[PDB]
Design a protein around this ligand. Structure first.
Ligand SMILES: Nc1nc2c(ncn2[C@@H]2O[C@H](COP(=O)(O)OP(=O)(O)O)[C@@H](O)[C@H]2O)c(=O)[nH]1
Ligand SMILES: Nc1nc2c(ncn2[C@@H]2O[C@H](COP(=O)(O)OP(=O)(O)O)[C@@H](O)[C@H]2O)c(=O)[nH]1
Ligand SMILES: [Ca+2]
Ligand SMILES: [Ca+2]
Ligand SMILES: [Ca+2]
Ligand SMILES: [Ca+2]
Lengths: 681, 681
């Protein structure tokens, strides 16, 4: 009469991980997404259920201080048909009972402890079934992070390899990145990352209860990448002397960054920069289920303190004399996260710009975001989370002053530089770049742009010698060779002029730091004939820039054309990206799941001098569980090619993007990638 | 005593089709590759083998007139260990006997009839086990068509969707093509194609015996595409009036072409052009196992009768007055097949240029090929199969004569046109274009090129006013809008000139046919100031070219600059490709094998006028067994976008390239493609 119910072999079906799009994550722990029912199988050694005999209720607690009011702890009874924490009986057969548990769409994210309390009237018992991790659901309708396009959900959540776009605005290069959010151990690393955040240390219960909202999780996640004081994922150095750590450009996948962080206590890992911060932030948010895409903005006005107007003071040569002034970044990277905003006036649901790179502010040094991109486009700077900084970054106006020899400065015309240019992020389902510049700004000169700027109360700036000049490069220039770049002057006036044109080309880092000039040509008496174009060539030599070039291979050409009669100053500036040698990747053998695959990577040295200490680094999520590195024994000469073969074992079927990086003493951070389609065994 | 051996349920294992890389082809018929052993399972209803009791020999015949000397018929006995037609016993279990049959590497290709003659001493019997198709093996070492790189074998044989590169040399567009060699029924269509060829009609036995060599099969296959008289796959019209048939540019996959051919008796299908001939030839050869890649050559000297020197006579405006003269083709397509050549001096193994497009010759009208590309590069025109024609196509010299008003003609300088330019074919394993121009020609001005030209006994042609002119387009121009193209003159001489510059832009077809001019600007007194560049603009209007534009969207700009003092003629010509509107393709639902998948295709109309009778055609090998076509009910207006949804059921897992074509009255043959990765069920 009324025998105690005893259970054994509780199994949390890994088939529901395919249902929850957490298939890769379901390795020795059950990971599911909120707002969606997940299968649960219970095995007993007696009566299968005996509902008319036994009543049992589930209790789940996630935080260290679980609270029912806070939403971190909830207990629910079992019923045969449907607060939104619901456990229901799908079926009973043999000695096995099959249940379907449902989590609320606003449930907090984190590790959960599942306990069952089965009291059959008299007596009864309580014990823990297991542990599971609840992530944001991009497929669950009414979840804050919901995407209506399945391809969009797949690319912005499930896809582990993508492109980080960098280089120059005129010539954009897609550097491959392996986000690898589902690489082994990363989810626990992200949970540790959240569990050591300042809000949690201050009040763990408040934080764990507040982790339901994607906006809070995004703020914390981006903050944990090299933003706040004490613990962080990365440490930032911009001075181009990364001797004691991994170079910022050397990175090819964020997986090793997180692994380095957790393995060495929780010390900031090596050296990181704006793209690295955005890439690891996107890895964390994608792992946690928040749809996130890394975005690059070219000619970005970073470090200005939310400033719409930047004034540059230049000398007679056009070089900027400011010692306090911060230069326009060649490009800046930040992330965008797809979520709904219930703390703002309705209609701001969508892409939110989270900038994990710390920005200078009067309040202090701290990363901006998340601000709806809609606010930036409409100029609604009153929106809560760091709207003016991002808007100023995209829509800053730059004014170039040239110092006259007599007293005051004179205004020059620079039409070659436009801020917030060629905003780009990887397209959904393709390798092509998607230009999202329209998402942040309206078309220039439109009524809609005018009203949006008026909303920011920023209506300033559009001209007053019928001449123009721009920098032209002709055909492409590869890194490691001397090449010519031309300064093209277009005179469409009856007047014929004698002028002074000053050309200076300087090795420049991606964040605007200018090194010493690698090319200089000054003409004090240049004759511009009427209604004609004149092109003055500047020869840039490999030897002149080799020592002081960045790892971003950026070189800035500046030209200043002065008409003396009317004393008119015309300025043209353009950033060249010296192209690295291509990496030729050959896949050897038939590519199949859990089958040895050989990848042969080779590059042909493009320098006059020999390359020494060459090292190939290869990383892929689904292609190799661990990063593969090969060191080349002997130096590689001027003509010679470096070719090596690395064995990989891919355990995931499907498309994966293998990223390769070659590093040498004279050539650094040359990237390559190859799409690999793994078949079934 | 000595019971008769009776067999039943003979099964030709479809698992060996995965072994033979014929997995897609193994549908209700066994297709295997020569030079490799294929599994065979025999079921009996008595003694499993009783070798000490029964001796049985296999006999296979392929042709209609099988001959042992010819190699079309061969009979071989069964032994337990290894003429190269070998049947051996791998294993015996229960009532089942498992054999492994081996075909010779030089075995002829075609349909084979497998017969077994089992005589157990006294009596015995004979009967047919089944039918199988033997194809070229690119994986079998020592087979003539052998590739050492697995990726190369996969792309040049197994890959069913690729790119046909066309457009202009300066701006190359990759048109997607669905070769679909493994699409249902195509292999039988190709065998019918071979079985109706002239050599077979003349002497079937000789042809079937000669089908062992890939060179013979290639000659016949390329011939059957619109080359020889009577039966052919395609019929060619170049006059741009394809009313009664499918347009040459409308095609997106060669599968429908072959199906149209066989379904309607064997009548030439619709209208075809050089790329169509090459595409169907590549489909046939890839289906038959010969590694083949379609190759495009820009500024190709086709229809010249193997001529290394082409003379053009032009008027005062630079327009070509020749009424007999054939113009330089903007681009020409042909195929390349990988095979060894035993009919030539050793060392010509490799890519063979087969040009299925019929070329004018003194002997008659007939397609060239297969000539080793090595011969073209080395200038060894004595090589057997149409070497001088292809070499002349790539390395022809063009001389432009401008007729003087007084008597004779005067020689002009055209540095804007170089023949055999930007030779390109789809890369192996990627969508990127691979430039194979180096494969046909050595670097200009090198000693190796000089000796190669000397081998062709073609050493002619490199100049004698320090001026130059080229056509510049600035930013891209989309089709359906007016745009400006500039004629850029560079004077680097102390002399200042007054000159006459004549600009004429004419709608041009891809094979050089020039329609009426859509832009004209003539300046009789243009002033070029010293040491300066002058750009003269020509406005090309949509209304001016809409009626007479080709389906290739090609427009040829011609500029003639005449200096009168020294009477120097400078010529610049360039072909623009008006870019079509992009097709935005959205994949809806999770993509899985044998699961309904929705593809939404949409394009935004780029014309001033409305589009009527819009029709979307969608084709994919592995995505749809049959071509899917949707007709848009109402006209699409100037602003509006055309968007439609087509259900597809993909039955093959893996990567497939879905090709889409949109056709309307005002916009024609706009292409798009999307890579689709089909997961398992
Ligand atoms: N500006 C720039 N152009 C590059 C770079 N690398 C290659 N290119 C080539 O430069 C060409 C584009 O130059 P463009 O913007 O048209 O200059 P312009 O036409 O002379 O005014 C392309 O053919 C590119 O392949 C680079 O780092 N910067
Ligand atoms: N020549 C040509 N250029 C095109 C076409 N369509 C787009 N373009 C654009 O033209 C630019 C390249 O022109 P380029 O060869 O550098 O001319 P140039 O620098 O003015 O002498 C690229 O930015 C292309 O995007 C076309 O059909 N023909
Ligand atoms: Ca988007
Ligand atoms: Ca001008
Ligand atoms: Ca090749
Ligand atoms: Ca000049």
């Amino acid at each position: 009469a009324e025998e105690l119910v005893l259970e054994r072999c509780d199994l949390e079906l890994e088939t529901n991980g395919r249902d929850h799009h957490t298939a890769d994550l379901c390795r020795e722990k059950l990971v599911v997404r909120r707002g969606q029912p997940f299968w649960l199988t219970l095995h007993f050694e007696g009566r299968n259920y005996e509902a008319s005999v036994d009543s049992l209720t589930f209790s789940v607690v996630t935080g260290p201080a679980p609270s029912q009011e806070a939403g971190t702890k909830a207990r629910f009874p079992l019923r045969d048909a449907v607060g939104d924490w619901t456990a229901t009986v799908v079926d009973q057969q043999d000695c096995t009972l099959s249940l379907q548990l449902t989590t609320p769409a606003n449930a907090p994210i984190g590790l959960y402890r599942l306990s069952l309390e089965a009291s059959t009237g008299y007596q009864g018992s309580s014990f823990v079934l297991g542990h599971f991790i609840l992530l944001f659901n991009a497929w669950c309708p009414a979840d804050a992070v919901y995407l209506d396009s399945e391809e969009e959900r797949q690319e912005y959540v499930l896809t582990q390899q993508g492109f980080i776009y960098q280089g120059s605005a005129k010539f954009i290069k897609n550097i491959p990145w392996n986000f690898g959010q589902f690489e082994d151990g990363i989810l626990d690393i992200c949970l540790i990352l959240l569990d050591v955040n300042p809000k949690f240390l201050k009040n763990a219960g408040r934080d764990c209860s507040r982790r339901s909202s994607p906006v809070y999780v995004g703020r914390v996640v981006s903050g944990m990448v090299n933003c706040n004081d004490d613990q962080g994922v990365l440490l930032g150095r911009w001075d181009n002397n990364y001797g004691d750590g991994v170079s910022p450009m050397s990175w090819i996948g964020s997986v090793d960054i997180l692994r380095r962080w957790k393995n060495h206590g929780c010390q900031r890992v090596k050296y990181g920069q704006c793209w690295v911060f955005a890439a690891v932030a996107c890895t964390v948010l994608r792992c946690l289920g928040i749809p996130t895409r890394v975005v690059t903005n070219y000619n970005s006005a970073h470090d200005q303190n939310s400033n719409l107007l930047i004034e540059y003071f230049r000398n007679e040569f056009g070089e900027i004399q400011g010692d306090k002034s911060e230069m326009i970044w060649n490009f800046h990277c930040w992330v965008e996260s797809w979520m709904t905003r219930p703390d703002l006036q309705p209609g701001y649901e969508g892409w939110q710009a989270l900038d994990p790179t710390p920005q200078e502010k009067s309040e202090g040094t701290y990363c901006c975001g998340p601000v709806p991109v809609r606010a930036i486009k409409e100029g609604d700077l009153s929106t809560k989370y760091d709207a003016p900084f991002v808007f100023a970054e995209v829509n800053a106006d730059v004014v170039d002053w040239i110092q006259q020899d007599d007293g005051s400065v004179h205004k020059s015309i620079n039409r070659s530089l436009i801020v917030g240019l060629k905003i780009s992020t990887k397209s959904v389902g393709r390798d092509e770049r998607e230009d999202i510049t329209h998402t942040y700004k309206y078309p220039e000169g439109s009524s809609e742009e005018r009203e949006a700027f008026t909303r920011a109360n920023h209506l300033n700036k559009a001209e007053k010698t019928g001449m123009a000049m721009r920098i032209r490069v002709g055909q492409s220039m590869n890194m490691g060779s001397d090449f010519d770049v031309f300064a093209h002057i277009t005179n469409n006036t009856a007047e014929e002029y004698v002028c002074r044109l000053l050309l200076c080309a300087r090795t420049v880092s991606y964040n605007g730091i200018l090194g010493p000039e690698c090319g200089t040509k000054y003409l004090l008496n240049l004759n511009l004939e009427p209604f004609s174009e004149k092109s003055v060539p500047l020869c840039i030599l490999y030897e002149k820039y080799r020592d002081c070039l960045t790892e971003s291979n950026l070189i800035k050409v500046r030209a200043l054309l002065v008409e003396p009669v009317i004393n008119s100053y015309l300025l043209a500036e353009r950033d060249l990206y010296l192209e690295n040698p291509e990496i030729k990747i050959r896949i050897l053998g038939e590519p199949k799941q859990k089958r040895k695959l050989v990848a042969e990577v080779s590059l042909q040295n493009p320098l006059p001098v020999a390359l020494e200490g060459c090292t190939f680094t290869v990383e892929g999520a689904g292609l190799t569980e661990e990063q593969k590195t090969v060191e080349i024994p002997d130096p590689v000469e001027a003509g010679e090619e470096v070719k090596v073969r690395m064995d990989l074992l891919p355990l995931h079927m499907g498309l994966h993007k293998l990223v390769v990086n070659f590093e040498s003493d004279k050539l650094k951070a040359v990237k390559g990638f190859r799409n690999v389609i793994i078949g079934p065994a």
